[model samples]
Target: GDQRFGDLVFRQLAPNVWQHTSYLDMPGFGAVASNGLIVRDGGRVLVVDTAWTDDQTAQILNWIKQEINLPVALAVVTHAHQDKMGGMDALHAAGIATYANALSNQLAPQEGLVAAQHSLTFAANGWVEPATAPNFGPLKVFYPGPGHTSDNITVGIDGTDIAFGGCLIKDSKAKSLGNLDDADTEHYAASARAFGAAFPKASMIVMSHSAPDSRAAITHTARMADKLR
Candidate 1:
């Protein structure tokens, strides 16, 4: 089956932050949805994550360029998951520089996901790590160790903590933590706490599979992780 931009829309979460949901059916699960962010940072447009395929990502890039009237310049793949980096090929094809952590870059090929164009081999040159971020104001990438995967990361933006949670945190209505094939259940609670502690000014937290929630989402997730631990 073919997917198109007509199947999705972007919902603005803040001044320069918007969330787009992309759906793809899996073998056992029907019509699964993944979330990505389209951010406007000054003259540059940044993509936080991408859809599950090249065609899906191409539509987003074209829409941003033709409709939004701004060149899509850079992107960040928060993890090595297909849903996070599946659009790398389209990004590379569109002349966008996609970046990911060194760990993510190392695991992506092994996990069979699209690899980012640029790799942040270390936390330098505008690169970052936990409790730190790029000099760019408002937008910061924080790595709170490993949770959903050994390479999962969170993005804090415009004073709002966009968890990106990937698979680390659960959705608002989720009764369980969802998939954990690549999760570190033991260290999850600590990881979530480290992330929350790093962003004391966070007004809201966004999860990968769910809508935005308050900081309580992190607390809830930490508790859940503890129980599962």
Candidate 2:
């Protein structure tokens, strides 16, 4: 009753964070449930990733209004994958500003996804680490190399010291690297390591396709990536 999103399922992890779960029929993976983070700050909200489709995004929005009683201000696409950026249309049509990395911004449509409504591109290949934005508290986006996808990015919530690993980090129970359809196996370790290093103080780690509270998510993902060689 606290944070249910329409018919979709979600579990609250902390005071301002909730993990939304969506299921899809994955070919080889069979039925899979993906995860996304919704953070509420003040009267505004920030979504880390969208659901599997525009319809699902709309449902989440409805829940936010009725339950959280706030307006979603922005959403960030973590990668070009459909599960992450598939709801771009919903976000845009609803007037919610969406953003993505330059690489993801360019790769989205290539992967047949609508580009995010807003683009947070930085020049010279250096990471863009800006201070906490107003209304959003300590939320920040970063590129920690590339693990699950070439354009995978991580979102940090400063108030909770929580890092939404997206698909870049693995769940605690994952024995392998999980999906690698567009993964750079050779350099995935480097990418995950860099991402883990980007935020060492991340006390609570949430990952896609798994429950949050993965204390060893980043470390386990890096270790799994290193085993690729």
Candidate 3:
């Protein structure tokens, strides 16, 4: 079942995981959709990314309070892209703690988006598993080489088999790689490979622009990246 709140849509992918979608209007490009996630654990919630705009993110916060009836303890933006961090102010306004990769925080201001309040740095091709946060489950943030952006990171919830691949991954329906304005063509394939390898147990991978799909989408994205090289 899908739930609609304002200009956003929320659909459950698993017991504790739900995917949220918002849209960005590009002239002559129609309204392009972007996806985020809502994961409930230990009676509280964690928001993966913000909506395409502050208003939409505000609506999400309201939905969580009014409908899910749970407090959002923390939020994380997968990258510095507008679709990922455009609504950062709304999250901050709601008093929710926010986090982003160190590199994402550095690039966010340049993109006109607010940087997350907290940041975690990752070594090249390495990952960091944040110690269990209060009221939240285990989270692994991995920076596979660079694909969609130099700062892109994947977030996977331990034991859930659900991973947020962000814009670094393409949906099964994607014909081309989509936006490449900040892509690393030279390393995109390797990045995709590393991402896939990092989540062997991931049965469902929620990408930013489209519906969540099986881990095969990672391979699909890698194949597309291969051609770009």
The model with the greatest lDDT is 3
Candidate order by lDDT, highest to lowest? 3, 2, 1
In order, candidate lDDTs are 0.74, 0.78, 0.86
Candidate 1 structure quality by residue, lDDT tens digits, 107-222: 98888887776665435322375332243345577777777787888777764445455557664456777777888988888887777876778767777777777877778788
TM per prediction? 0.87, 0.90, 0.94
Tens digits of per-residue lDDT for model 3, 116-142: 998877754577534423334656778
Candidate topping TM-score: 3
Error in Å for residue 167 of model 3: 0.3
Q: Rank order by TM-score, top first?
A: 3, 2, 1
Between candidates 2 and 3, the one scoring higher on TM-score is 3
Model 3 bad stretches (over 4 Å): 123-125, 129-136
| Total backbone collisions for each predicted model | 0, 0, 0
The ten-residue window of minimal lDDT in model 1 covers 124-133
Give candidate 1 misplaced runs (Cα > 4 Å): 1-4, 121-137, 159-163
